[PDB]
Amino acid sequence: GTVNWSVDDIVKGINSSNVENQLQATQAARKLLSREKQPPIDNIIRAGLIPKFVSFLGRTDCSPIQFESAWALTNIASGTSEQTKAVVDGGAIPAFISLLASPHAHISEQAVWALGNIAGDGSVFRDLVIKYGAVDPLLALLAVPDMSSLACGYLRNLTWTLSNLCRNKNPAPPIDAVEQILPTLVRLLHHDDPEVLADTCWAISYLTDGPNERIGMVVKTGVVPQLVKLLGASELPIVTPALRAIGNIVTGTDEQTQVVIDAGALAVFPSLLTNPKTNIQKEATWTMSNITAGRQDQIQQVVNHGLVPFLVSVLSKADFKTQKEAVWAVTNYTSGGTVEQIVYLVHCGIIEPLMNLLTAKDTKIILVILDAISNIFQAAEKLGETEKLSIMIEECGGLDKIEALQNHENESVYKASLSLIEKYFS
Amino acid sequence: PVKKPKIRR
């Protein structure tokens, strides 16, 4: 381990009045920092090199040292928040924005990469990158008639950096920035490169992770049908963020949820709800749960697409984190659904797998299940069939499981189970 | 990924 002497040599070289020595020193720093295993980032920072690197970004008289310095700083910024902060505090952001206009594509694109790492740190550095004016010149690099005229690597790196400018909350990105970027994201969603598509979906998943107003900005672009197309892709790295975006949109208004339904999303859910990735199954069941939180006509679309048997199957057989989402989908369905819809749900066999989860060691899920049972009894009341329902629940051992909850630590569970027993099993 | 270093192959 001789990194400390290498760093000492770099400091000496970088302070040479001979530019060839300075360049060689920056080359050596770039090499150290491009090591896969524990690059010596802190050593380089502690040696006081960041101000030197930032100065070199501006050395138009020596494009190679701009390149080497840009790469070195890219990799420091790829580190911890403290490491990224040292780069920011050194004044790197406006220097990198200036380099976006370099006539040297390899330098411009290295600046793109560094800014992606800086913005990726979080909302504060994201907003600094925006504040210093990065968006316009980034978008200009992408404003060519043919996106295939750009090297695949360059377009991927631009897309990724744009996605980080869309990322994070508290605060969300400035609205005017989102308005600037969104039309480019919509264009990119029709590209054929899978990595571009994946990062563009991630960007859109970020923008839809927020209040209805933000969701509304995305929906109004008309992009939802293309997202639904990507939902059916075979590439997991595309489906994953596409599904997150769609799931985020249906946390919005009934009208926003209708856009997703009208776009044909529900037809994809038999595949998603049975997808061998448990994560896809879970996120798809979460998405379904926010659709069954919708209007009765939206529930009816879920019914009409044959999805209720899929929901019963997930509730019965899936991993517990996915079963939790299925419980929510059921409770939402039963909260908002018509009596007929609820009768159909019971006919599909919801009661036994629902009851079986009352043994779960998750208090919140127990409470959600008891809500669902109460909701189903309310439909039974309108029909004059509360006794038939109570007998069904007894006959599958459901009442034994409800009775058992009178010993539960949680008072709401005790009170809820007691209430059902008093109302319907006394 | 959120952040990414540039490395040779």
Residue numbers in the entry:
A (entry chain A): 72 to 497
B (entry chain B): 297 to 305
From the paper:
Canonical human TFIID consists of TBP and 13 TBP-associated factors (TAFs). Among these HFD pairs, the TAF8–10 heterodimer plays a key role in the TFIID assembly pathway, is critical for the integrity of holo–TFIID and also fulfills essential functions in early embryonic development. By immunoprecipitating TAF-containing complexes from different cellular compartments, we identify a novel endogenous TFIID subcomplex formed by TAF2, 8 and 10 in the cytoplasm of human cells. Taken together, our data suggest the presence of a nuclear import particle in which the TAF2–8–10 complex is bound by the major binding site of Importin α1 via the NLS of TAF8, poised to shuttle into the nucleus.
Biochemical and cell biology experiments demonstrated that the C-terminal NLS within TAF8 is necessary for shuttling TAF8 and TAF10 from the cytoplasm to the nucleus in an Importin α/β-dependent fashion. To define the binding region between Importin α1 to the TAF2–8–10 complex, we determined the X-ray crystal structure of the C-terminal NLS of TAF8 in complex with Importin α1ΔIBB at 1.75 Å resolution. Importin α1 residues 72–497 and residues 297–305 of the TAF8 peptide could be unambiguously traced in the electron density map. The TAF8 peptide binds as a monopartite NLS via residues 297–302. Importin α1 tryptophanes W142, W184 and W231 form apolar pockets, which accommodate the aliphatic moieties of lysine residues K300 and K302, and position the TAF8 NLS backbone via residues P297, K300 and K302. The side chain of K299 of TAF8 is coordinated by the main chain carbonyl group of G150, the hydroxyl group of T155 and the carboxylate of D192, whereas side chains of K300 and K302 of TAF8 are contacted by side chain carbonyl groups of N228 and Q181, respectively. We could also model a less well-defined short amino-acid segment at the minor binding site of Importin α1. Using Importin α1ΔIBB as an analyte and an NLS peptide comprising TAF8 residues 288 to 310 as titrant, we obtained a 1:1 binding stoichiometry with a dissociation constant in the low micromolar range (Kd=10.4+/−0.8 μM). The crystal structure of Importin α1 with the NLS of TAF8 reveals that TAF8 has a classical short monopartite NLS, which is recognized by the major binding site of Importin α1. Our crystal structure of Importin α1 bound to the TAF8 NLS further suggests that the cytosolic TAF2–8–10 complex together with Importin α1 constitutes an import particle responsible for delivering this building block into the nucleus.
